[PDB]
């Protein structure tokens, strides 16, 4: 009944987060640019996940996703906004532009392309709205060294999020964002946002961060 | 089977937090200035609860407040240290020092005197360790006109936070802290903090704010 | 011709301070508890500076203080509220109730008493207002090991600087605060305040932290 | 003798930091899209200010930009990295793709670009280092409706000057960032922004925030 689209849903903290709202009872739409691994996720589910194959720094794919989650659910209720490159750990001055670019693309714009796209369904739905779950740092506290396309990345989902909840209000969406550090199991961060997900929509996780030992 | 102490008990996100962990399973003691709310709570809860009338303003109080809990219960799993007082709404040079001290002593000292109990139980008891999660501000992100002493003692909480954080590893003690704002239920704040308190040790949320509408 | 208040002026960045806003022109107030430190102080500076011992944390003493500056100098622009003390580094749960009260009265309540006693002053002279810049933490992105009552405190101060700035505008009352940390010269962070002290009252660095190598 | 690049130095901040740096006795290279715009930046000057018409999105225009730098003058001791572009403030999934990979661009990319130049040239010259100023966000306390690619990009410069940092210091460079924001007039910002160049190389201002009124 509440339905779910998980983006890098064919591995790590995606798979465990699709997995976790189909416990939870959601449908779920499983998103990334793989077949392979969406259907191991799939079969993890062994209910009526739909496996769409997906390039989310590609508008129309985009597009393509969520009217595919649409068709088959009759809704959008949630996306967890996931991704997480990383470039190369070499001297910053060493990174070629499509090294760079690549990071942009990935960690920025697709995340931005699926807010997009889900204010377009989420504000045209009855009942109207939903929640926008955007997942942002592995190093929450202290960037790593040679990591600045990623880290610059990540801080830019923090501003996001932060105008997606802004400019989603009207439409009643809200939007919230998990970041992770160390001082970890995917099974917390799904168990997180499951958590975060599970709030009705006046009420909002808009930070959270989890810490590992 | 695992213990709570929770602090401001008697009425608002205290009492909500004590019905909600008695209600995922866990043995609560209730600490607050009167017992009639005390009871109140404990009656809620319709099982085991201790009431413990406390000042945790008072060092022998806090101690009195632990002893009691492991008397019962035999160890002391999680603390919910909740405080919340604010000075009256007036120019910031109207405030008497008395208004200044009670509030410093209520949501600064209370705290920080229940965070050293916390250390010397739970580094004590056998498994060792456990969490103290330590009740923020409810002006989040931007604080209320005439509100220095409730705004700076907030701050505070975050600071002490960050040290509890680090100085308990050695014991196995994890602090995180909980924030809420406004662009709200008590129940929300309560089902976060069940969450925050559902970890296994090695995974913490340290920093979540929800903010209402 | 503009007038600072200096606290802590008898050692380190309160010395330093002093000396660079009397550099700059500035006449001075130096307060602090020892009158030989302030001595030093004053024949550094090698003009007008004025001696006032004080005790910070006694708003008898603090009134005191505003009045001798005030009747030397004719008015209040400036005050650099600077505080700065530490428990020992021990276990958290080893200090004792005097030695975490020491720590909240000298690095909260002064600066706190202080701004209370400047919005009397600034609020009350002509051309009205002037501008509260706070010390903050030497540690600013981590704290030290067994350090709460200094990182509490010094979080502490930033929610005091937050309230502050937002209550003193209708006096034209401006405040902000400089903290520092490490990857330092009392000169850098004297050369900082003075910066910060130089904007006129309707541009103020609310915030700068300088990271020493 | 010290050697500044100043970008965007045709207008509003950029000049006033040019006019401001050049005033305190640095050479100074202008570097932005219109030729017509630098030669007033330099006209201001007055001395020998070298316009540099410069794409800073584009990587050979910005290594054109500093060869042309390190020809005349010798070195680069500081780079006044400064973009600001913003999208126009219509509904978030209004914006076409190009409008959203115009702010990236220009307010991501070219700053990145240009501390990869700048790695390059500091790391190479002798004495080596030097310093990185970014220019962070206008409206740093609360993001504007309508504004998720500014606000995006403007919180990726934050991560931006995090990771320089920590990456620059192995070739003494130094990286800080100064953000704006309301509770104004450019000459404050350039004022700052000579006193961040002022320090040596082992002080740093990492972050300053000036809010106006
Ligand atoms: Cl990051
Ligand atoms: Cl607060
Ligand atoms: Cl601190
Ligand atoms: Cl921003």
């Known amino acids: 009944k509440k339905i779910a689209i998980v983006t890098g849903a064919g591995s790590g903290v995606g798979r465990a987060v699709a997995v976790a709202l189909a416990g939870a009872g959601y449908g779920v739409a499983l998103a990334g640019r793989r077949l392979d691994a969406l259907q191991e996720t799939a079969?993890?589910?062994?209910?009526?996940?739909?496996?769409?194959?997906?390039?989310?720094?590609?508008?129309?794919?985009?597009?393509?996703?969520?009217?595919?989650?649409?068709?088959?659910?009759?809704?959008?209720?949630?996306?967890?906004?996931?991704?997480?490159?990383?470039?190369?750990?070499?001297?910053?001055?060493d990174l070629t532009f499509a090294q760079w670019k690549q990071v942009v693309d990935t960690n920025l714009t697709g995340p931005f392309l699926c807010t997009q796209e889900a204010f377009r369904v989420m504000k045209a739905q009855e009942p109207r709205g939903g929640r926008?779950?955007?997942?942002?740092?592995?190093?929450?506290?202290?960037?790593?060294?040679?990591?600045?396309?990623?880290?610059?990345?990540?801080?830019?989902?923090?501003?996001?999020?932060?105008?997606?909840?802004?400019?989603?209000?009207?439409?009643?969406?809200?939007?919230?964002?998990?970041?992770?550090?160390?001082?970890?199991?995917?099974?917390?961060?799904?168990?997180?946002?499951?958590?975060?997900?599970?709030l009705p929509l006046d009420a909002n996780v808009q930070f959270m961060t989890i810490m590992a030992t």
């Open 43 to 93: 079969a993890e589910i062994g209910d009526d996940a739909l496996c769409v194959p997906t390039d989310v720094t590609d508008p129309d794919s985009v597009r393509a996703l969520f009217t595919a989650t649409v068709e088959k659910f009759g809704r959008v209720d949630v996306l967890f906004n996931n991704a997480g490159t990383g470039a190369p750990a070499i001297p910053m001055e």
């Open 132 to 198: 926008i779950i955007n997942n942002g740092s592995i190093s929450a506290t202290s960037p790593r060294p040679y990591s600045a396309p990623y880290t610059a990345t990540k801080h830019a989902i923090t501003g996001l999020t932060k105008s997606t909840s802004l400019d989603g209000r009207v439409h009643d969406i809200a939007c919230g964002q998990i970041d992770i550090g160390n001082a970890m199991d995917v099974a917390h961060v799904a168990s997180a946002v499951v958590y975060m997900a599970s």
